[PDB]
Amino acid sequence: NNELEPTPGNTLRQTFENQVNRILNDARDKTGSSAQKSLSEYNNFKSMVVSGAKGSKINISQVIAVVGQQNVEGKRIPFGFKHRTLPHFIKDDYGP
């Protein structure tokens, strides 16, 4: 509905992508934090991450909660087909 105002130094597409990436990153971070808080003291994932032997807090988050956004050349997944990513989706679909 053309209500979005463009950020200084940025295109309308650039600010739209920035806002969506901000929302998704905040979501992924919050889910990871919740998953890390839910861990017990006996959990072997926590026992390995805390000691720093191997693995990390993002690995725990991806295993338990949400794998997260997938990026191609530092951008969100492009439109290899005409105006869509796969033939399963509708044209002009910018949803997550």
Added chain:
Amino acid sequence: RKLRRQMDIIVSEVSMIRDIREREIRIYTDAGRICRPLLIVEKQKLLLKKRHIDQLKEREYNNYSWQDLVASGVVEYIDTLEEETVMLAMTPDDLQEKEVAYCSTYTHCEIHPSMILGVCASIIPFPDHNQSPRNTYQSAMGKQAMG
């Protein structure tokens, strides 16, 4: 499309494409085009029905096979640049139904989503629970497994 589905004078290997915005219609009989079979969806319903499945389950001693399934207009071969004009449904029982109405113009449905994998990647149990580099490593290492 009717003639291609009836196999009448257009071989099922011929691909036909209508680009509406540019007003072009392209027909390819050329060799080397890669294609895969898909189920036809009319309205919200598959054209594959219970009699086809019964006959295919009694496939032995009935001389009824995948060619007879193709000749009935149930399955269709589609190549890469015809997929651009195709609205695909991942599974019938899930995406044909009156869920919240994302789309209603579905024209095709996949046989099974696991058919997107190759020969070496089809031996991996639970490949959607792994990281893609590890799936690639297994696909490469399976050719070296002894037997």
Added chain:
Amino acid sequence: GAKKSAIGQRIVATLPYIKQEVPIIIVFRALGFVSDRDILEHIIYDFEDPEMMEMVKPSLDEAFVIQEQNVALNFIGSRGAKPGVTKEKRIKYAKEVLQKEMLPHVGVSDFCETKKAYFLGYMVHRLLLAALGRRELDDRDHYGNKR
């Protein structure tokens, strides 16, 4: 420089077995279409659409100095594989090149010059549509563009 600044972009063709670039209007005149209305009628389908007219105009002005088919054929032959000793030898060589090595899939019999004109006009029209931004540039890794 002032002469260049006044006119901007020109469409040129790189024909097979011909040394360097050739203006499009010269090739079209060599195909047997002397008149600018016929040439633009093969290039532009929409006579009502001014953006295309403005894009095409410098190409016409570049090739104004050649106004008849035999002169255009001599102009093309002068840039052939080797400069022919006699003018008619160059004309015959250019005619053979434009019949055989130019767009062989469109046709080879001397009737088909009209169809060659339409196909070349379609090529130029697609280039103009890409230059106006009315169409998307083709993706080389699009797997339907591959055999």
Added chain:
Amino acid sequence: KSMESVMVKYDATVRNSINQVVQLRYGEDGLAGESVEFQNLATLKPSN
């Protein structure tokens, strides 16, 4: 390949193969980089 000949001489100067002076003391303080550690000055930050 560019740095292969740069070397500390017995003058404690750093010179290349042509004896051209690159540094008058290695590291501008003449110390090896393996025996040093991180430290705090404790005189820099404080209020007067």
Added chain:
Amino acid sequence: DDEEETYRLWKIRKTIMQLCHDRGYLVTQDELDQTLEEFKAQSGDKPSEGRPRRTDLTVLVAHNDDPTDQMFVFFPEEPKVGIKTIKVYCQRMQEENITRALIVVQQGMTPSAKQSLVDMAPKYILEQFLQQELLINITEHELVPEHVVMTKEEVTELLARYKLRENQLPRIQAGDPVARYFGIKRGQVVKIIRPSETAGRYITYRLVQ
């Protein structure tokens, strides 16, 4: 226009007074520090068909050691300088029997006139300076450390202490902007003092070639 052309001339003059002070001349503190309003009152404000014509601005300064060593600074009125104009400057230079002078060119100088500057070198030495190069003092930039021109006795002591031949030192080319600023010639040695985060201070010597 004219208020900003006045501003440009004031910056050029201030940068030239700093240049002369850094080269070791008698420059008074008032000449080093002149407010825009004071300069405006002294030279009569707007330059175009006004009192600060470019020729009104020339600077004579004396060396501290000997007042017989003097530098003129010239401000040619022409956008480009020619052999004729440089010969007029050299004629005036001979009439005073000064030996060193500068030229502040508004746009650029013809190669035939550049060749003429160097042709004169054993008699009178002239140095070209573009207007933009003098619009800011590069010596006061944070990246540029302190440069000190060494005397011959100091260079000899340096080479005796480190037992070095002259070519074994790091080099600095004569076209270096700092070398132009300090008026350094081939064969002289500059002393660079810069701070270091490992030692605290470090002194480097560059030979001018």
Added chain:
Amino acid sequence: DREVLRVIFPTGDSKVVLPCNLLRMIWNAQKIFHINPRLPSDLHPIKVVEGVKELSKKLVIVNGDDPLSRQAQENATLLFNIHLRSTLCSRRMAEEF
């Protein structure tokens, strides 16, 4: 030395890489010699200053008696000498260590 440090390190970054760890060394000495912080010390404050001054002469990076060599030696060891004096302050020795 504080003024010199403020000239050398704008932005006030106090983390510096130096050869020998004086805080760890002082802590080693305290434990080796069984020093009780609860009791008055017998270390005379003149000897702290004199020992620091005499030690600073024995840390030589540039060997020479020329004024050029002296200046080079001072520039090479300025930062470490500043740190050494800051840590071996007589008041700091009497109060903390």
Added chain:
Amino acid sequence: KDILCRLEHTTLRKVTANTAIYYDPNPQSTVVAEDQEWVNVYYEMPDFDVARISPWLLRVELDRKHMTDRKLTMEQIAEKINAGFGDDLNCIFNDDNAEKLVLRIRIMNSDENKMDDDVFLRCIESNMLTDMTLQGIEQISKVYMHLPQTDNKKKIIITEDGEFKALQEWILETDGVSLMRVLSEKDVDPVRTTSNDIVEIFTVLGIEAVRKALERELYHVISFDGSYVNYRHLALLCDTMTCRGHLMAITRHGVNRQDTGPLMKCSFEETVDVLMEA
């Protein structure tokens, strides 16, 4: 913001809505509807309709949004066009209250007393749109303004108590580099203004400045990942690159322009040719 608008390159094309070339054989009997008013206001006591005036009219429209975003004035635009070309154009321009904003341009007076009349007017349009350079410094594409959150580009000063206080001030980051003219600019800080280009810093400030700037660039690109490398190696690399008095690139060209032995050079990147020259 004033400095941002004074630092950014702006051509006449960015503020121009559309251009049309008209044919008006007489000054007063104009083919456009609205131009008649100011046409009569300027020609009732005519400014330079003294020699003949040309039948061919050039007419540029200016978008008000872009005109007011950059704090431009139509008087400024007319002055700039007239000064850049001389008297070879006569510039007629609107009241600032004209709701659709017009700058009526005709070819030279005395030329009305070779390139054709319209073809030169088209060539003029194609020159002005790309070359007129209304504001700022060329090779400066965009200028960004923001308040830095990182202490390495916040201004840190010493208070009256001797403490270190970090201040937040607006800083500008450009796309494209022209260092000399930016250091000249009014209210820009000459001490602290720097660029990431090495050759640009060289040709402006000299060799010690490149030493320090190259050291900073190498430190940034190594410590951005969070890793730490000792200062001595960075210092040695910069000293070797800047030792000979000019920027010695670490390539076949830069390494082999050193006066070293040919057997050292043949063992790096030009094997037979080095020995052939030797």
Added chain:
Amino acid sequence: VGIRFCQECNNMLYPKEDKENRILLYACRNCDYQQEADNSCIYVNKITHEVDELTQIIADVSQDPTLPRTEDHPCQKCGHKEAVFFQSHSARAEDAMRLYYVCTAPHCGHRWTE
């Protein structure tokens, strides 16, 4: 504005000045033909690319099964509920996300923009 062609010979006209009247004309250097030029503009240039795509989108796009379609926005003239919507393709603009609507029923080739 637009191109026009000479009556004698089906070739492009271009402008000239009649210096005897001091009045504009079209002419054709292929032949001996002069014509009155009523269009007072010879060259126009929409630098900002002002255009909305209603003059470039076709009504046949309503038959595309892969385009999205909402009942939200009704057509003006007929009020059919169904209308397929899609984005801009023009590159030079202040905006890049506005939706172009085409009425879905095949009898109503009406197109509009909200």
